[PDB]
Scaffold this active site. Structure first.
Site, PDB file in Angstrom:
ATOM      1  NE  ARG A   4      45.599  44.942  40.748  1.00 26.22           N
ATOM      2  CZ  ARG A   4      45.168  46.185  40.978  1.00 26.22           C
ATOM      3  NH1 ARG A   4      45.914  47.236  40.625  1.00 26.22           N
ATOM      4  NH2 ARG A   4      43.977  46.396  41.527  1.00 26.22           N
ATOM      5  CB  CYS A  15      43.636  41.847  37.974  1.00 25.44           C
ATOM      6  SG  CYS A  15      44.440  40.329  38.467  1.00 25.44           S
ATOM      7  CD1 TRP A  33      45.014  31.093  40.789  1.00 25.66           C
ATOM      8  CD2 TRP A  33      47.105  30.708  40.048  1.00 25.66           C
ATOM      9  NE1 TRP A  33      45.900  31.689  41.676  1.00 25.66           N
ATOM     10  CE2 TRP A  33      47.183  31.471  41.243  1.00 25.66           C
ATOM     11  CE3 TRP A  33      48.293  30.332  39.410  1.00 25.66           C
ATOM     12  CZ2 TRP A  33      48.398  31.863  41.810  1.00 25.66           C
ATOM     13  CZ3 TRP A  33      49.512  30.731  39.983  1.00 25.66           C
ATOM     14  CH2 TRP A  33      49.548  31.486  41.170  1.00 25.66           C
ATOM     15  CD  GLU A  63      37.939  34.721  37.640  1.00 27.27           C
ATOM     16  OE1 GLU A  63      38.232  35.236  36.542  1.00 27.27           O
ATOM     17  OE2 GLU A  63      38.790  34.168  38.384  1.00 27.27           O
TER      18      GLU A  63
END
Ligand code: HEM
Ligand code: HEM
Ligand SMILES: Cc1cc(N)nc(C[C@H]2CNC[C@H]2OCCNCC(F)(F)[C@H]2CCCCN2)c1
Ligand SMILES: Cc1cc(N)nc(C[C@H]2CNC[C@H]2OCCNCC(F)(F)[C@H]2CCCCN2)c1
Ligand SMILES: C[C@H](O)[C@H](O)[C@H]1CNc2nc(N)[nH]c(=O)c2N1
Ligand SMILES: C[C@H](O)[C@H](O)[C@H]1CNc2nc(N)[nH]c(=O)c2N1
Ligand SMILES: [Zn+2]
Lengths: 403, 403
Positions: B110, B107, B279, B284
């Protein structure tokens, strides 16, 4: 034991069995993956690397166990026993060279691995002769813009003595001159190498594309400066299909990508100077060389010509400009009739290469982070392809800088 | 130097050593022989895992060695001895959930780890109550467009007792209908789950963008089917800042990216249903969801509208189109005043996250291929950052599909 490799685009699945012929360790362990690092930090060992390489050779020409294979093994044992080393036969060399490219996990152009002009240069004794060889290699490899892949193999390293080296990282390279203001005219990557040339007697230019000279090193001698005959070094001014103002940035790149600082290991022999060349993939130039912040870093400039909004990142001015830059490279090369391959075509034929190597060998070592191009990643089939990395021999290695 | 992985940044020339990896109590898939870095999926034991997490908790509140610390320790091994499991204190849970997000190598968001809202739902006892809980989560997290990170934790695995599971991979997903023609209408990623819903009683829609119902499973029961009230599912119609025709494509996406099939492991205890949400990063939607060959695959469609030469790769038509589609995403989210972050901004804050983590813990596990975005790799600074990947705990794990 044998790992399972999936393509997430097509749901297809293979098993790498090639990875068991890895005799050399990498940086990862079960506790942490370090696969993103760029680099590392007796008769018996050589004899088995040799035996293995010879077996690989007679296998490659389907004569395993035959007559000439037996006598050749005995020839090697005999030569190591009495001398601590041995030498390769021309064809054996030619095989190992092709194979070390085949085995290179970070090369996306391996579809071509079988088509490689090999220059035997093992009969080199002076830097003078190195320069001569380096010039015939270039003339060969350039071929008026119709690029032919090549390698030149200078004499192997020897325990008594120093190495033959080419100090340059690439046969063709642009100088990086360090200014008063602590900036850089030319290529920032080549600052230290430009400094050496100067210290060993070179008069420097002061443009942004001054082809550096070559520093060639014969065993245990000071390196020597040789200037490359300007007509051998094919360059390509960059223009852009629709943007008339582009050409006036006076951008240009050289045609021949020829690495010259790596070591070539074959059958546990080591070749410290063995430059190799093929042809560019556009992103190398358009994305890395021209857009890296620690390179020519032209993104902001170009984008302003395009009149895009630099103030925020969400106008995607970096990406927008990055595309026109790669575009400009492709057009310019295609127009000067010089071999270039874009990142789409290249990755498509690497998928193909993966498939060839699958049936032929049971796998293909590949370094995903290096195989996936630096723009438009997921847009290319390799992004979606799981890949196993490991070290097979023959191989190219990184070696220390000679100084 | 130090005996921990040395970690270089190649744009800046800066160095760090990762000492955090020493804390890793669990193997991942690489070995010295081969790197599997790019693969997508890979009583006694309990007590020591629990001990470990309690030690972590006490550290974070500065209480390592103290009466409360060691009493809590005594307290936990008492509970395990007596019943085989144990239970977390409320703040312990909040700590662990945030620690699992902090510990997640894949991710890039972070930097926000410290600001996550933990909803305790360990009292939940029905699939109705599960639904309710999810609705509040979506409500809170969506916050009319001003998105807020959240996780809703349902009850843990029990010895010989069925799990609490959400069958859907994400709380919001678009249907994927298999066509008699061979093709797929909607998102092809979601073919199976769509088919599992119809089977469990859902009346299918007709569209490219039909929001799926929820399959929720209370322990030991068949999953029950729940439809999200539309007013809860905030979506963003897509349009382009300048290409007026784009809004005509009728493309859209939902605001709230909410993973729901991941296992959350804290100190031994396993929470099989513990959905989390944040969010989007622009890429993506715009690059994976919309441009992947195996998803909506709208690249060709859009390039025709932009009028590019799609008959050759070297027009970089894919590149151009993908950039406009990503741009369309940001403009549209910005316009609807719904939180989003482009790949540049995001990757920048991840560099800052890395700097922070160095100081606090001495490292940060990071899956390079996953951190680097699917467009414009080398244009973002993470591309020039070396990364060590290793598994820390608390963690989010993948887990088998419940059916
Ligand atoms: C023929 C056309 C070729 C293409 C299109 C091509 C493409 C590439 C690309 C894109 C890279 C990544 C390098 C970077 O970004 O710095 C690379 C690396 C590499 N290639 Fe090629 N290549 C070609 C020919 C060759 C040849 C002829 C050889 C050897 C004879 C070779 C061996 C290698 C090796 C050893 C690397 C690794 C560089 C490193 O480890 O730093 N390639 N290639
Ligand atoms: C706050 C805004 C956030 C952003 C912008 C963000 C960004 C991302 C991105 C881009 C990915 C890669 C997804 C893909 O392309 O497949 C990812 C993965 C992930 N994120 Fe986040 N994230 C955010 C918040 C969160 C939160 C709240 C959590 C949970 C507490 C979380 C946990 C994870 C995990 C566990 C993964 C790995 C998914 C996998 O392994 O398949 N992130 N994140
Ligand atoms: C044969 C061939 C064909 C082709 N198209 N492209 C190539 C790689 C070239 C081109 N474009 C970059 C350069 O790659 C040079 C190899 N890598 C260089 C490096 F980044 F690793 C650094 C750090 C350590 C070692 C020295 N230099 C080779
Ligand atoms: C919390 C959060 C914030 C954010 N910006 N983004 C996310 C990832 C979401 C959205 N966009 C992709 C998805 O990530 C979900 C997990 N990705 C892996 C997968 F999709 F390939 C499959 C196969 C393996 C098992 C799981 N699912 C989460
Ligand atoms: C740190 C990271 O591994 C490094 O920047 C790599 C990433 N991928 C690459 N890929 C290619 N082809 N060439 C490179 O030089 C790099 N650099
Ligand atoms: C094949 C490869 O490992 C796979 O396609 C990965 C690469 N990097 C990724 N990175 C993110 N954020 N999400 C992904 O799904 C992937 N896919
Ligand atoms: Zn690895």
């Amino acid at each position: 034991k044998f790992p399972r490799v999936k393509n997430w685009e097509l749901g297809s699945i293979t098993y790498d069995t090639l990875c068991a012929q890895s005799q050399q360790d990498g940086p990862c362990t079960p506790r942490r993956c370090l696969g993103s690092l760029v680099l590392p930090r007796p008769a018996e060992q050589l004899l088995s690397q040799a035996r293995d390489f010879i077996n690989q050779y007679y296998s490659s020409i389907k004569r395993s166990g035959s007559q000439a294979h037996e006598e050749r093994l005995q020839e090697v044992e005999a030569e190591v026993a009495s001398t601590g080393t041995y030498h390769l036969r021309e064809s054996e060399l030619v095989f190992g060279a092709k194979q070390a490219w085949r085995n290179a996990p970070r090369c996306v152009g391996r579809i071509q691995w079988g088509k490689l002009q090999v220059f035997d240069a093992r009969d080199c004794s002076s830097a003078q002769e190195m320069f001569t060889y380096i010039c015939n290699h270039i003339k060969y490899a350039t071929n008026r813009g119709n690029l032919r892949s090549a390698i030149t193999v200078f004499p192997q390293r020897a325990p008594g003595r120093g190495d033959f080296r080419i100090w340059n990282s690439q046969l063709v390279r642009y100088a990086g001159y360090r200014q008063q203001d602590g900036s850089v005219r030319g290529d920032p990557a080549n600052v230290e190498i430009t400094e050496l040339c100067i210290q060993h007697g070179w008069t420097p230019g002061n443009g942004r594309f001054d082809v550096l000279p070559l520093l060639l090193q014969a065993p245990d001698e000071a390196p020597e400066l040789f200037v490359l005959p300007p007509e051998l070094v094919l360059e390509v001014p960059l223009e852009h299909p629709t943007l008339e103002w582009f050409a006036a940035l006076g951008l240009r790149w050289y045609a021949l990508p020829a690495v010259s600082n790596m070591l070539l290991e074959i059958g546990g022999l080591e070749f410290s100077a063995a430059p190799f060349s093929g042809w560019y993939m556009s992103t190398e130039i358009g994305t890395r060389n021209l857009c890296d912040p620690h390179r020519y870093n032209i993104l902001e400039d170009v984008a302003v010509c395009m009149d895009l909004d630099t103030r925020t990142t969400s106008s995607l001015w970096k990406d927008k400009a990055a595309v026109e830059i790669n575009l400009a490279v492709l057009h310019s090369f295609q127009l000067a009739k010089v071999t270039i391959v874009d990142h789409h075509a290249a990755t498509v034929s690497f998928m193909k290469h993966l498939d060839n190597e699958q049936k032929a060998r049971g796998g293909c070592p590949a370094d995903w982070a290096w195989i996936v191009p630096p723009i438009s990643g997921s847009l290319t089939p390799v992004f979606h392809q799981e890949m196993v990395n490991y070290i097979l021999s023959p191989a190219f290695r990184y070696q220390p800088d000679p100084w």
